[PDB]
Amino acid sequence: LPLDTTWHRPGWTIGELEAAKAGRTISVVLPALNEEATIESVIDSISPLVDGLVDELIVLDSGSTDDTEIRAIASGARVVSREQALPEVPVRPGKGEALWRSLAATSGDIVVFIDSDLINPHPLFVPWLVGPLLTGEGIQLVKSFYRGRVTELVARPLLAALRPELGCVLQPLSGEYAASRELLTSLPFAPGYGVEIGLLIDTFDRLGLDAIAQVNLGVRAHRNRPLDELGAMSRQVIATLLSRCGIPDSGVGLTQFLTRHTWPVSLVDRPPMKVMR
Amino acid sequence: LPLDTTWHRPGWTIGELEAAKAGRTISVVLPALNEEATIESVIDSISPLVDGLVDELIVLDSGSTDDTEIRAIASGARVVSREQALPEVPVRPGKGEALWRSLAATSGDIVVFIDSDLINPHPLFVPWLVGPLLTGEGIQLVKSFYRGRVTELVARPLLAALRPELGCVLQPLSGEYAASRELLTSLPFAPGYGVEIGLLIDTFDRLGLDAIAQVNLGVRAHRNRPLDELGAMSRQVIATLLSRCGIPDSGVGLTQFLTRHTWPVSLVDRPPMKVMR
Ligand SMILES: O=c1ccn([C@@H]2O[C@H](COP(=O)(O)OP(=O)(O)O[C@H]3O[C@H](CO)[C@@H](O)[C@H](O)[C@H]3O)[C@@H](O)[C@H]2O)c(=O)[nH]1
Ligand SMILES: O=c1ccn([C@@H]2O[C@H](COP(=O)(O)OP(=O)(O)O[C@H]3O[C@H](CO)[C@@H](O)[C@H](O)[C@H]3O)[C@@H](O)[C@H]2O)c(=O)[nH]1
Ligand SMILES: O=P(O)(O)OC[C@H](O)CO
Ligand SMILES: O=P(O)(O)OC[C@H](O)CO
Ligand SMILES: [Mn+2]
Ligand SMILES: [Mn+2]
């Protein structure tokens, strides 16, 4: 593949990777909205790395109203609200907002994102993801893949239509990935569920494929959302993808008939966090 | 809805509808590719209308290699191959080809399409669909709806993005619909699975919503295809939708990793069947 792809279990040990840091730091961010059932398992999969390979782990709590925050705290995680991450700026809804704000609440040269709704995640996710950033050259972004309705019906076919160079990316919508701060604070952040696809297209347009790697995380399980919520997610993915391709989006939310309901869509990106410096 | 929508069971009787024909004829087309398990049930749901409300029923056999044709014949249906429908023109693959060719093998002023993979279809499908064409004014196209992964994730959200006026169409991808010959032979036909969405957008752009109605057919069951085949279907739907919206499509087929496989996509429409006159 024209895309650096690690097809089998990476061979790097935790101690090698740590040596390879060479003064660089690593932050881990778990965005979370109402994931009380899974958040503790995810934090626990990663907290053993802290003060070693990982210099920092935070939960970016994105407005949870369940026990996400208390359970995360009881697992020893630093929990940061959207408001605390960036208090001069009023909070908008959606995942992209949470991730963008997380840049202001972390200081790692490398930032790793892991969804907090994962079912029994491997403790090597973070080592496997930072590998190419640490030991490669010019890699600034690493995507995960795994053995994807929105992914297989919406994002990959749309990429084939409009950015076929990215056809080799197996899981463009993957919530597990790592990237340099220099890259992330230089890119705008799409709102809502548009954030991954925006980052991928923006990264590629700006640095080309050679700046991107992907690593196999094996098998993945997570919360299965209802079709209607996916419809809304897909709508936002489309809105962001069309925008990156110079195509005007109507700005009209998807409507569904159960009576009538209109879901929000946003055509507004957050600017590169750099301007907030 | 700005779209003429019949929300409950239509009240027209078969005898009223027949009276309303007023010299107009009605053709029914069942496109079929390897539907031996369901084809007989579908034909039988409709053949009682023949020589009455329905003047003509054909199965457009689209290259079947199972018992579709023999079973359809044994149910008393006229079976027409792609080659027989239009023998001067070599056959291309896909559904859109079959439907376009079916225009050459029928002569009804009204043409009704019904998928041949339906599980126990109602015998009133055809009466319910021709209703607005017979008793309305200016209606040239009638779509069905029902209580849709490609539909809900790809087509409706893309329509919301690019032709939001069509947001009120509940089942844009529905295989059950009827339209005037005058309309159908005036429109190009998208290849493969692009044919429905192309017809809807072309119809709207040319006649506006007032020329379109939709009728509730209740509940629908059909063959559930694997995700990868849907991926390919979605790719073609996207290709056709982008084209109708003036957006250049790469022409690159969707690739999937199981090793690598590329599915065909086509950017070539068939012209209005009128030019073949
Ligand atoms: O407003 C939100 C919505 C989600 N999340 C968190 O983000 C993660 C992913 O959200 P989820 O609802 O599980 O998304 P998915 O349906 O799995 O969507 C997939 O595809 C999306 C589009 O790229 C990605 O954003 C997701 O990370 C990816 O898992 C979860 O941990 C959530 O807790 C927030 O923090 N705030
Ligand atoms: O090359 C082909 C492919 C399909 N068919 C027939 O067309 C009908 C619909 O095909 P199907 O594979 O069942 O499509 P769906 O997955 O159900 O796709 C839905 O969405 C598509 C995109 O609009 C429509 O074309 C379909 O009619 C609609 O049911 C079936 O009776 C097939 O026998 C052909 O005749 N030739
Ligand atoms: O929830 P699924 O089964 O529709 O697939 C979700 C993938 O992990 C992300 O698109
Ligand atoms: O086969 P489904 O369940 O994915 O839905 C199919 C609809 O009838 C057409 O998009
Ligand atoms: Mn999830
Ligand atoms: Mn079907």
Swiss-Prot record, chains A, B:
Residues annotated as binding Mn(2+): D117, H222
Binding, (2R)-2-O-(alpha-D-glucopyranosyl)-3-phospho-glycerate: K95, G148, R149, V150, T151, R220
Cofactor: Mg(2+); Ca(2+); Mn(2+); Fe(2+)
Gene3D superfamilies associated with the record: Spore Coat Polysaccharide Biosynthesis Protein SpsA, Chain A
Origin: domain of life: Bacteria
Assigned protein family: Belongs to the glycosyltransferase 2 family.
Protein name: Glucosyl-3-phosphoglycerate synthase
Organism this protein belongs to: Mycobacterium tuberculosis (strain ATCC 25618 / H37Rv)
